[PDB]
Amino acid sequence: SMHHTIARMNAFNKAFANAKDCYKKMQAWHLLNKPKHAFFPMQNTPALDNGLAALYELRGGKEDAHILSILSRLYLYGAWRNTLGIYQLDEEIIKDCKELPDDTPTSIFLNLPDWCVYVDISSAQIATFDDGVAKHIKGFWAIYDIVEMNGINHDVLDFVVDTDTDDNVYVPQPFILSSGQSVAEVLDYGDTSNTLIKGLLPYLLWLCVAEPDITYKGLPVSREELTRPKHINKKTGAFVTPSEPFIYQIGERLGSEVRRYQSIIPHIRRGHWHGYWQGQAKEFRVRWQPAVFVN
Amino acid sequence: SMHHTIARMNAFNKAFANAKDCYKKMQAWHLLNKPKHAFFPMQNTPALDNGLAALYELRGGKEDAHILSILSRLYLYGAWRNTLGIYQLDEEIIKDCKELPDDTPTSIFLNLPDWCVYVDISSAQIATFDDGVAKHIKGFWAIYDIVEMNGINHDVLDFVVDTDTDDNVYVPQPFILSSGQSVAEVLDYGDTSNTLIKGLLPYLLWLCVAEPDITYKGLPVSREELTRPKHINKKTGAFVTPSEPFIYQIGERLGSEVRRYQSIIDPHIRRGHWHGYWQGQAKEFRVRWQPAVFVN
């Protein structure tokens, strides 16, 4: 079957007929500017379509839900349509991804493989509120952004929640990274959004660490393999985009190992992230600590 | 209007006709044993009703959902009906209660005023899963329990989620306090349940700290007042139970200042948070609320 994300993206592309032209504009901007991490800034989305810019210029247009939905979606799909990476977390790893080492640097989240990735965490049974209603979080997109605040561009990681519903709120939730501070400092000093983000970072960390457990159709994908540069027509400048999503498993091998322990039935000590230091010119390391089997 | 918790409790008391007798048995047990914190242990609920005990003895009775629900509800309501304390958190404070310090002792959660309290956190917009469905957490009960694990008694705080739904899962989620350890240790080191509980602890802390903001119908209720001994008919041994809930506000005064600052702004507000610290040998703990401040 077609993934519900792809079906909703296609339906949006039909219902907003200018979407493909907007994606073409975004590509042009990216080729012009060549940003270090993002594909196209959320800030520039109003400029992409003149009718949307006009409606957005009306009083209350900057707080309209439908218009921000379309703009957020243009930003999201414009970055994501170039790779269509879907990463499904193994349930045994879901139940063990709970937190990050509190001293974790924001810089580590600059290590994502693409401009935008989709992460499937449905087994985590996390919910949220598109206000007025509680909904199951099927997954989320992580997508880079460039935000100019008081004269300076800032590296931001935006999170877009996917509840697989018609009225899904696609508005991104930002998480600043352009500082030498830690996750706790950005998140915990400076909140609904922050709480949500703080829950999603342990899952996203798999696409940032040096030693992940990523497989494609059962074959291991190394970190070098994941980062291996993709090949934009060099004589035409056009973008080539996938016709189907690329669906990976994260932590399947690990899960498989855990599933063997449970089959035996004397106890399992679950895995977790583990992080530490490396006085001056210090460094960070985070590695997964696998579940171990005792007695 | 009648609070939904009370309506569901009455409907349960009607649908399970032996409930009141079971509550009387619990009272007798309490008077015999006089535990330090709990009213009646979850462990003894199968013994309360013979038909339920018989169905519980069947293969798969132990894991049956309906039975477990009845037992859970007897345990919950038997303690809670003696006080009917409902504590509603103020919107401005709910929003600033996010976590505790990891160092926070488990012992501090022995400071609750009743055997069982209900906390209304509707505005926190927290959700959960009665499996297959996502639901809004309207509130939760915190209720003490006493559990023998491997031959020894243990002090436990149980959490019961309230989603205000017919098929609500009333099964308690335990949290051990007998250790002398900290929240982070008991929880994180040792999880779905643990995660939920971790989220709930910041709200429950208001009923444990030395300087809370609790008001009843606009009147301050001090910690000494809250903790004052209640009056069991001394000649008869009967329990007297409230006919209506006692509804308190937590953080209403605090919220009012915060509202005030917003009014002026309509300059910034630094939000409040819990703040904790130490007090080398024979050390002690302190937690206090840090209020929101107005800047510029």
Distance of CA B145 to the CA centre of its chain: 11
Q: What tokens were used for A76? A: 């999201």
Chain breaks in chain A (C to N over 2.5 A) after: 190, 231, 265, 278
Q: Does A95 touch chain B (CB under 8 A)?
A: yes
Residue carrying the six token digits 């989603």: B163
Number of cross-chain residue pairs from A and B with Cβ atoms under 8 Å apart: 37
Do the chains contact at A129 and B125, CB–CB below 8 Å?
A: yes
* Spatial CA neighbour of A182 closest among A102, A110, A62: A102
Q: Phi, psi at residue B295, to the nearest 5°? A: -110, 140
Q: Does B123 touch chain A (CB under 8 A)?
A: no
Q: What tokens were used for A288? A: 């997964």
Q: Does B98 touch chain A (CB under 8 A)?
A: yes
Q: What is the structure's resolution, reported in angstroms to one decimal?
A: 2.3
In angstroms, what separates the C-alpha of A195 from chain B's closest C-alpha? 8
Which structural technique was applied? X-ray
Helix (H, G, I), strand (E, B) or coil at B76: helix
**Per-domain boundaries in chain A:** 4-294
Question: Least CB-CB distance to A127: which of B95, B129, B271?
Answer: B129
| Helical segments of chain B, H only | 4-15, 19-33, 45-48, 50-57, 65-80, 91-94, 183-184, 192-204, 223-227, 252-265
Alpha carbons within 13 angstroms on the beta-carbon side of residue B115 total 24
Question: Least CB-CB distance to B95: which of A129, A134, A191?
Answer: A191
Dihedral of the alpha carbons of B94, B96, B98, B104, in degrees to the nearest 10:
-100
Do the chains contact at A99 and B125, CB–CB below 8 Å?
A: no
| Helical segments of B158-214, H only | 183-184, 192-204
Q: Does A289 touch chain B (CB under 8 A)?
A: no
In degrees, to the nearest 5, what angle opens at C-alpha B76 toward C-alphas B9 and B216? 75
A135 contact residues in B (CB cutoff 8 A): 127, 134
Q: What tokens were used for B22? A: 């079971």
Helix (H, G, I), strand (E, B) or coil at B30: helix
* Angle between helix B19-33 and B65-80 (nearest 10): 60
- The phi-psi region of residue A132 (left if phi > 0; otherwise alpha if psi is between -120 and 50; otherwise beta) is left
Of all residues in chain A, the one with the smallest CA distance to B102 is: A102
B96 contact residues in A (CB cutoff 8 A): 191
Of all residues in chain B, the one with the smallest CA distance to A137 is: B134
Q: What is the 3-state secondary structure (H, E, C) of chain A?
A: CCCHHHHHHHHHHHHCCCHHHHHHHHHHHHHHHCCCCCCCCHHHHHHHCHHHHHHHHCCCHHHCHHHHHHHHHHHHHHHHCCCCEEEEECHHHHCCCCCCCCCCEHHHHHCCCCCEEEEECHHHCCEEEECCEEEECCEEEEEEEEEEECCEEEEEEEEEEECCCCCCCCCCEEEECCCCCEHHHHHHCCCHHHHHHHHHHHHHHHHCCCCCCEEECCEEECHHHHHCCCCCCCCCCCCCCCCCCEEEEECHHHHHHHHHHHHHCCEEECCEEEEEECCCCCCEEEEEECCEEEC
* Angle between helix A50-57 and A65-80 (nearest 10): 140
Residues A215/A253, Cβ–Cβ less than 8 Å:
yes
B245 to each of A60, A166, B66, B77, B80, how far by Cα in Å?
44, 40, 27, 13, 10
Amino acid in the structure at residue A176: I
Of all residues in chain A, the one with the smallest CA distance to B129 is: A125
Do the chains contact at B191 and A99, CB–CB below 8 Å?
A: no
Q: Does B195 touch chain A (CB under 8 A)?
A: yes
Do the chains contact at A191 and B96, CB–CB below 8 Å?
A: yes
A191 contact residues in B (CB cutoff 8 A): 95-96, 98, 271
Q: Which B positions 269-288 lie with beta carbon below 8 A of chain A? A: 271
Pick the residue of B94, B195, B295 with the most A CBs within 10 A to test the interface with A by mutation.
Answer: B195
Do the chains contact at A129 and B135, CB–CB below 8 Å?
A: no
d(CA A2, CA B200): 39
Do the chains contact at B98 and A191, CB–CB below 8 Å?
A: yes
Q: What tokens were used for B235? A: 């000649």
Do the chains contact at B271 and A129, CB–CB below 8 Å?
A: no
Burial of B211 (0-12, 13-18, 19+ CB in 10 A): exposed
Q: Does A136 touch chain B (CB under 8 A)?
A: yes
Q: Does B135 touch chain A (CB under 8 A)?
A: yes
Q: Does B198 touch chain A (CB under 8 A)?
A: no
Q: DSSP state, B18?
A: T
Beta-sheet pairing, B246-250 with B85-89: parallel
d(CA A131, CA A215): 37
In angstroms, what separates the C-alpha of B1 from chain A's closest C-alpha? 22
d(CA B114, CA B229): 10
- The phi-psi region of residue B223 (left if phi > 0; otherwise alpha if psi is between -120 and 50; otherwise beta) is alpha
Question: Least CB-CB distance to B191: which of A98, A134, A135?
Answer: A98
Do the chains contact at B127 and A125, CB–CB below 8 Å?
A: no
Residues A156/A142, Cβ–Cβ less than 8 Å:
no
Amino acid in the structure at residue A17: A
Q: Does B134 touch chain A (CB under 8 A)?
A: yes
A129 contact residues in B (CB cutoff 8 A): 125, 127, 136
Burial of A133 (0-12, 13-18, 19+ CB in 10 A): middle
Residues A172/A39, Cβ–Cβ less than 8 Å:
no
Do the chains contact at B188 and A98, CB–CB below 8 Å?
A: yes
Of all residues in chain B, the one with the smallest CA distance to A126 is: B128
Do the chains contact at A95 and B271, CB–CB below 8 Å?
A: no
Dihedral of the alpha carbons of A204, A210, A211, A215, in degrees to the nearest 10:
60
Do the chains contact at B188 and A135, CB–CB below 8 Å?
A: no
| Residue/partner pairs of A47-50 with CB below 8 Å, 24 or more apart | A48/A22, A48/A74, A49/A18, A49/A21, A49/A22, A49/A74
- The phi-psi region of residue B150 (left if phi > 0; otherwise alpha if psi is between -120 and 50; otherwise beta) is left
d(CA B134, CA A136): 6
Task: Work out the number of other CB atoms within 10 angstroms of the CB of residue A125.
Answer: 17
Do the chains contact at B127 and A129, CB–CB below 8 Å?
A: yes
Q: Does B268 touch chain A (CB under 8 A)?
A: no
Q: Does B130 touch chain A (CB under 8 A)?
A: no
* Spatial CA neighbour of B42 closest among B74, B1, B84, B3: B74
Q: Does B213 touch chain A (CB under 8 A)?
A: no
Where b means 16+ CB within 10 Å and e means fewer, A40-53 reads bbbebbbebbeebe
Q: What tokens were used for A197? A: 């983000």
